[PDB]
Amino acid sequence: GHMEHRGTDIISLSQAATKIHQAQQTLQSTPPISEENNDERTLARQQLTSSLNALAKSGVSLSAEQNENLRSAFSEIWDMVSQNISAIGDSYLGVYENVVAVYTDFYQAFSDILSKMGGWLLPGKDGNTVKLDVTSLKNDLNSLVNKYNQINSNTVLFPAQSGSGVKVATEAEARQWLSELNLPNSSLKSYGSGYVVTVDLTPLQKMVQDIDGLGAPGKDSKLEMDNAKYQAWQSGFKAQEENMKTTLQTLTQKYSNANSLYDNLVKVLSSTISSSLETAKSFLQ
């Protein structure tokens, strides 16, 4: 117990610092907006846990102070830290990444429909009226609804999906995420032996109702409307667009904060490792 080994300690601690810093760079720079990006972020967390696994076996000793920091931050020591952080990565941050990537593609599908609206607004019989192609707009929104009302990897926010299954959760676990995500009750769905949480279609479904609200189209499938009525319909349609945008914004902020919670634990690892490196390089005179 009397043989020091500064050299080995320096190598071990420097190796762990480098792998931690590398995983942290990926997790700070890679947006959770695609399956490919999320695979890179998942791999970064695997590299980080593996580095704590090697560090645990290295025989670097910690001060009581570092021991305490680790205990308080993450509630033999390194294995406890590694299990705790791994669990936060898999069960919390990993779910949020999936929520964003799924919502991102869904929102892009909605944006693509919005990009067609210009073409569905035509001149009216005079300068006080317009013609709205209510039929083509309703059909596109209904197609979106039909697509994202299904249960598959285009639609499921929780659990994260992979391979052949539909992976499902208990009603209790799914309700907890429904609440965590601040999504409407309609986003909780049963599938086979359990439950899933899906994208919110309610604003789209409200858009389609407000369109039928305008009245039956004419023979051409379009709807002639006075300027005031069109402006009033347009303002209601924009309000629903804003509901979708607000839901997405809540979700991406919540992701960022789950990413920040994981990063704050990474900062604790890095400071602890830096302190130990200093100890290994310091000679008390």
Provide the binding-site residues for Ni ion, judged by CB under 5 A.
Answer: 1-2
* Cβ nearer to Ni ion, comparing 2 with 219: 2
Residue nearest to Ni ion (CB): 2
| Local structure of residue 282 (DSSP, 8 states) | -
The least CB distance from residue 11 to Ni ion, in Å, is: 20
The Cα–Cα gap between 109 and 124 comes to 29
Give which of 178, 113, 191, 110 is closest to 150, Cα–Cα.
191
* Cβ nearer to Ni ion, comparing 8 with 249: 8
The least CB distance from residue 8 to Ni ion, in Å, is: 15
Task: Tell me the two tokens of residue 84.
Answer: 């705790």
Q: Which amino acid is at 167?
A: K
* Cβ nearer to Ni ion, comparing 2 with 125: 2
The least CB distance from residue 171 to Ni ion, in Å, is: 57
Helices (H), 33-169: 35-56, 64-73, 77-88, 94-114, 134-148
Gaps in the chain following residue numbers (C to N > 2.5 A): 75
* Cβ nearer to Ni ion, comparing 1 with 163: 1
**What's the gap between Cα 243 and its chain centre?**
18
* Cβ nearer to Ni ion, comparing 7 with 213: 7
The least CB distance from residue 104 to Ni ion, in Å, is: 57
C-alpha distance from residue 114 to each of 51, 55, 122, 223 (Å): 47, 52, 16, 18
The least CB distance from residue 9 to Ni ion, in Å, is: 15
